[PDB]
């Protein structure tokens, strides 16, 4: 925290150092069906752009 | 007030009277924890607040 190898008589607050956190944690919702890519990308027909 | 070049006025009795000053001597004493208020405890900052 001083930048210094030398430390004076002080009470010396001082910035935290350390690790917490090792455990990692996903929460997500329960979905099974795949997206509907085919129907989407793979169709035999477009839209016109209008 | 009534002024005269011959006339004075002298007090014939006392008042002893108790008042109350405040001053202000000290103020809180604060500290902040810039990484703690920037970067929120997120491992990806402070490497920029390096
Ligand atoms: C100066 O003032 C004090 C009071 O401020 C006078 O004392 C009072 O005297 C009367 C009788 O004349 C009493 O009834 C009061 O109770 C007294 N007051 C107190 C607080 O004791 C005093 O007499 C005055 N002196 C002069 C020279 O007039």
Redesign the interface.
């Known amino acids: 925290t001083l930048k210094s190898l030398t430390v004076e008589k002080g009470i010396y607050?001082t910035?935290?150092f350390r690790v917490q956190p090792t455990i990692s944690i996903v929460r997500f919702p329960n979905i099974t069906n795949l997206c509907p890519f085919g129907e989407v990308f793979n169709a035999s027909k477009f839209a016109s752009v209008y | 007030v009534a002024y005269s070049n011959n006339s004075i006025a002298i007090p014939t009795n006392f008042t002893i009277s108790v008042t109350t000053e405040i001053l202000p001597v000290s103020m809180t004493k604060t500290?902040v924890?810039?990484?703690?208020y920037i970067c929120g405890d997120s491992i990806e900052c402070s490497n920029l607040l390096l």
């Open positions: 607050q910035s935290n | 500290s924890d810039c990484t703690m």
